[PDB]
Every structure is written in C-alpha cells, then in structure tokens.
C-alpha cells in the first residue's frame, strides 16, 4: 500500500556516505577553469579558522526594506599568515585523466614543512631532502632540465605551498602543504612564475580582493556515533513506545528483502568534507596594522581580537580574512579558501562592502566593553589598581 500522506525525504542523497573524511585537510576537488588571457595568479589559499564576530554594515540593495539602513551580521575570522612556495608540479592530459609528470622542489625547505614528512620527528635523523638539496650543486642543470620538461609537456601547473603554522597560536608544529593551481598565462609563464617564487612568501592580498565571493573547503565538526533523530532528523516515535523512541520505525518493506541504501540509520555524524560557496570577503586585514578592528567611522585603535583573545584559539596577529556568515569546520581547523568557479554579476556579488563597526567584546561571556580603556573609564579605580 501507498503512504497515507506524502512527505519529503529526510536528508540529502548527494552527501553519502556520511562517513569520516579520509584526511583532515580539505582538498580542492576542482579549481577555476583556466583562461590564458588573464595574468598569472594563485587560485587558492590556506588559512586557520580563528572564530566568529559581529559587524554592523549599511546595506546598499535598492528595493529592500533595509536599504541604506544598518544591519547586524555574523562574520568569520580566518587567520591567514603568508604561505611559502616550495615546489611546482606539472600535469599532463591523458585519456585516463590528468597525470602528474614531475615535481620540482626548492633548495631550502623550512623545518615546519620538513616536519610534514615525519610521524616521529624527534626520533629521526632528519634526512629528508638532503640529497635533493645536493641536487642543486653549483649549476643545478638537472633541475632546470626537469623544469624544461614541465614547460614542454605539462598542461596544468600547480605550485606547492605550505602554511607558516609557527606564526599562529596553534601548538602544532607541522606545516600544512597543499597544491594550489596556477591560472593565467602560458605553461612556460606559469613555470617561470613558480621558479621565481621558490622559497618566497605569498600573501592573501595577492590572492583575494575585497568584496569577492569565495568558497571554503573544510572538514566539519565531529560528533561521533549518532542516532537517526539527530543524524537524519527523523520524527521521534510516541512517548509510550516499547524499547525506545529515537528510531526509524520501518526500515523497509518486506520486498526487496534487503535494507535499502536510502533508509536513515545510526552512524557517524560530522567530520565530513564540505565545499561551501559564495562567502563574501568583508575585510582582508593586515597583521602589521594596529587598527585592525577600526573602520572609517569607528577610529578606535583596536585589533580584530576580542578581550581575552579568541576563545580556544588565541590572538590573530597575522593578516586575516573576514568572511560573511559561517564556514565549515571548527576553531583551529585548516580551511582552504578558493576563488569562485563562475562569474556572478548579481547585486549581492557586486555590492561594495563598507564596514561600520566590528564587535570586539569578550567571547568568553556576556562581554560589555570593547576595550580595556573603556572598561577603566566605566568602572573607575579598583582596589587591585592601587
């Protein structure tokens, strides 16, 4: 017999299996499609999720009931110190897909990136890349030959860059190494750009501009083993049901005499790989600036950091990206910020953002002051102040 009443599906069949990600670093499945006429530029950047804050902004959206009026909006802070370029990979188009032809590395790799190749660094002789460093012996023509091979045969060029995780408050010492595709120009131009950028730092302001819509690749918050009620949002059974109520009552008809792949079942929730698109960049802040949190209307010399630091992260002392809304992942998660895969000309995408004010009250409680100076002015002298 048919259902007595109709209802939509619980959950999406486009995100199966709801299993743990194979890696904690989210990987860019697809890069922006290459257009030769543009200049040579990076298409992605790696950062660390610091925390969320609040802004106030005047909306510029004609026809809206909030037009030219202040809105209060949630924002995400991504701590993004410059990444270091250490390598370059050439890819060849084959009837079986892209195939990596050759990887050329820089002469000197920093310790934080050489720790990436070790499970037990303290017990090691730290021999990584020593013969390769010897490959640079006084003319390095074998290295130029490999670069020429990349120029001659590669159709897709990606750079190898790692984060400077020592500039973040994280206790982890391993850097995060990722391939970032180079778009624009010919293959020879891309290879020349990579070679001239070996062992150099690349900042966020060279990858992302303000008012851009960008995508975020990250692994979400882990919840462990979870039942159907919260994993899939199914209806709880009546209170008086024997053996419990947080279940799916019928997991299948008699035939097919198997449990179908479409029935909601208990299992692991969270820690999934997600690509979330169209997050607007409200601010590309600079770490050397002492007025990170100041705007053109609030000139209080103020960093982006709340009082007492970001809860369970620390202070953001680097360049940062202020994104609209929420992005996947937890605090301290490595986040991949990718340029958009299409051209959006909608008013939301082309709107120019001017921030009014950034919240810097404590996130560790109902903070009611924006600055220690303001707190002192409000409360006056205390006993501990003498």
């Amino acid at each position: 017999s048919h259902r007595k009443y109709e209802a939509p599906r619980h959950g999406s069949l486009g995100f199966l299996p709801r299993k743990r990600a194979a890696k904690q670093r989210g990987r860019v499945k697809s890069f922006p499609k290459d257009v030769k006429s543009k200049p040579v530029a990076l298409t992605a950047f790696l950062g660390y999720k610091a925390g969320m804050t609040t802004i106030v902004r005047d909306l510029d959206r004609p026809g809206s009931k909030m037009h030219k009026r202040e809105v209060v909006e949630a924002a995400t802070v991504v701590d993004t110190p410059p990444m270091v370029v250490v390598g370059v990979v050439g890819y060849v188009e084959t009837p079986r897909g892209l195939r990596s032809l050759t990887t050329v590395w820089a002469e000197h790799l920093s310790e934080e990136v050489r720790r990436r190749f070790y499970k037990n660094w303290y017990k090691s002789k730290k021999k990584a890349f020593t013969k390769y460093s010897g490959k640079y012996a006084t003319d390095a023509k074998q290295v130029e030959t490999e670069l020429a091979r990349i120029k001659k045969y590669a159709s897709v060029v990606r750079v190898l860059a790692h984060t400077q995780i020592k500039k973040t408050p994280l206790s982890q010492k391993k850097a995060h190494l990722a391939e970032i595709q180079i778009n624009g120009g010919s293959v020879s131009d891309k290879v020349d750009w990579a070679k001239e950028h070996f062992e150099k730092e690349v900042s966020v302001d060279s990858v992302f501009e303000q008012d851009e819509m960008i995508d975020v690749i990250a692994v979400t918050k882990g919840h462990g083993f979870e039942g159907v009620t919260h994993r899939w949002g199914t209806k709880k059974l009546p209170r008086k049901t024997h053996r419990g109520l947080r279940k799916v009552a019928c997991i299948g008809a008699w035939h097919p005499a198997n449990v179908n792949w479409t029935v909601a079942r208990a299992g692991q929730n969270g820690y999934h790989h997600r690509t979330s698109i169209n997050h607007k960049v409200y601010r590309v802040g600079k770490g050397t600036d002492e007025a990170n949190g100041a705007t053109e209307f609030d000139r209080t010399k103020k960093t982006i950091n709340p009082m007492g630091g970001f809860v369970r992260y620390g202070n953001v002392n680097n360049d940062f990206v202020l994104l609209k809304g929420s992005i996947p992942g937890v605090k301290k998660r490595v986040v991949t910020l990718r340029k958009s895969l299409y051209v959006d000309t909608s008013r939301r995408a082309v709107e120019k953002v001017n921030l009014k004010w950034i919240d810097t009250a404590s996130r560790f409680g109902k903070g009611r002051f924006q600055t220690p100076a303001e707190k002192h002015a409000f409360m006056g002298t205390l006993k501990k102040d003498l």
Binding site: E70, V72, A361, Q370
Partner: protein, 63 residues
C-alpha cells in the same frame, strides 16, 4: 550605530546585544543580557542590587 543603556543595571548595550522589552503600557526597557532581564522579570529593585550603576549613584560611590 548608537550605544543604548541598560534600564536595570545601566551598562552599555552594543549592536545586537541583549533584548528589548515592550511593556503593556508601551514603555521600552532594554536589557544587555539574561541576567538583568531575569532580575527585571523577577521584580528586583536596582536600588537594592549592589552592583548596578543606579545603586552606586544612590550610595554615592565613584562620584
């Protein structure tokens, strides 16, 4: 953006913080958090609540 003042405790309210309460007589009270909001619905007297600004001015402290 302008900073409001808590009707109960007198502390500054920044954009998005706390709640706004409209009494039956159309009078508007602003609370920065559920602490002062709860004491207000609990009918507490800020002159008798030792930490509010109103209390400190009533007892002439820091003036």
């Amino acid at each position: 953006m302008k900073i409001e003042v808590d009707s109960f405790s007198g502390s500054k309210i920044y954009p998005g913080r706390g709640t706004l309460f409209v009494r039956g007589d159309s009078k508007i009270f602003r609370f920065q958090s559920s602490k002062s909001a709860s004491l207000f619905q609990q009918r507490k007297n800020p002159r008798r609540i030792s930490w509010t600004v109103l209390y400190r001015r009533h007892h002439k402290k820091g003036i």
